[PDB]
Amino acid sequence: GRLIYTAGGYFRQSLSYLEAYNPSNGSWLRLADLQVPRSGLAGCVVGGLLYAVGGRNNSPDGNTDSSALDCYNPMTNQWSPCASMSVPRNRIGVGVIDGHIYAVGGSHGCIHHSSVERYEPERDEWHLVAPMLTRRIGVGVAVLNRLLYAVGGFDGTNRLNSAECYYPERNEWRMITPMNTIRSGAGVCVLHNCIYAAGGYDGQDQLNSVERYDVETETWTFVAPMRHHRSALGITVHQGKIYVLGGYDGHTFLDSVECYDPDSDTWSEVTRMTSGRSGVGVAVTMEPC
Ligand SMILES: CCCC[C@H]1CCCN1C(=O)[C@H]1CCC[C@@H](c2cccc(-n3ncc(C(=O)O)c3C3CC3)c2)C1
Known part of the structure; x- marks a missing residue:
């Protein structure tokens, strides 16, 4: 694409920033905040849509592991909730194969996941696949x-x-x-x-x-x-x-x-x-409007 998007993060608490960097001119550009703060999330892109996956909201009034899959459209500069994973996944990994998003591992409380599940954007649905041989x-x-x-x-x-x-x-x-x-x-x-x-x-x-x-x-x-x-x-x-x-x-x-x-x-x-x-969470896609 063109821009490097960074979403969420942590400094003293979980963050909601969505900022885009343009390696062509060195400019940063703050975009629509995440609806829910989250750290330890992952970012990816499928068909021009940016996805924020899993994470955890470390906040003064509580800590909540996220099973959320949120979706950002650069044209509209808006987030929208998408189907939630079967399980919360903090400190997560994600990977895209054939337009499908694989959510890998992560933590929920003190439960460390070996499980893995796949999201099909065309059906707005998750399905569990084979787990990893190791919790990660x-x-x-x-x-x-x-x-x-x-x-x-x-x-x-x-x-x-x-x-x-x-x-x-x-x-x-x-x-x-x-x-x-x-x-x-x-x-x-x-x-x-x-x-x-x-x-x-x-x-x-x-x-x-x-x-x-x-x-x-x-x-x-x-x-x-x-x-x-x-x-x-x-x-x-x-x-x-x-x-x-x-x-x-x-x-x-x-x-x-x-x-x-x-x-x-x-x-x-x-x-x-x-x-x-x-x-x-980081990914790369088109510029917004
Ligand atoms: C919640 C606030 C307290 C933690 C603060 C202060 C100390 C430092 N730190 C942070 O930078 C936090 C911020 C939230 C996200 C945190 C995060 C993200 C992704 C993966 C992991 N991760 N997964 C496994 C392990 C491991 O160690 O094996 C780790 C640790 C990084 C090594 C942790 C990092």
Whole structure:
């Protein structure tokens, strides 16, 4: 598309911001607020519609895990509730295959989900698919060659380097090569034939390391690290370059936005969000009106 949308997040409380960044002119642009604050959500795009999935409203007067699926139309600049998932999912992963949205893992209270469900925008309906072999909250999700990948996260006791892959036609999950670094709450995306895992939390500190999985070779290879350690960062791809947005570096909620150029293997600070925050949902689509 054209704009990088960031929705929700957390700073002192769950947030309702919807701001769009234009990598062509460096401009930010605040849009319609989310009807319900939510952190640990995920963002995705299907047929020009932006979707905010799961999360959790950490607020003074209470904390409520969200099973919501909200939908934003850039032409109207309006949100609209859509069908709700079977189960609340905080610290969630999502991935799009054949116009369908896969909601992966997440937490509801202290229940850590292995379950997975798929949303069909044409029927406004969810349906549960096969669960993951492992419970994963704060899981990174990526789609490559119509295959879904769940990478890292937290399973209730330990934080994981493990990763697994879902083959839709079989409705089946299988382990793939684990990462070289334990990552939970990382930024996972796809670029070319590789699945990048950036930052996260490894049980002790926030990570700035970045590695990528080559499906052909089935191996993880480290790559130039980010300039800031990050956890609960937003991540997306725009014109063959990765953008990581915000996160927590261990002491401050970052407004830093970094951009990875895979041809030069370098990271550079593109801009800075209008305020520091972690746990945002990110996606990319057309400009609004
Ligand atoms: C609710 C307020 C208190 C938490 C604040 C202060 C300390 C820091 N932090 C935040 O940045 C919060 C903000 C809300 C969203 C939070 C979030 C989003 C996505 C994934 C995860 N996630 N999933 C698994 C694990 C794990 O550790 O294994 C994690 C943690 C990031 C490592 C957490 C981050």
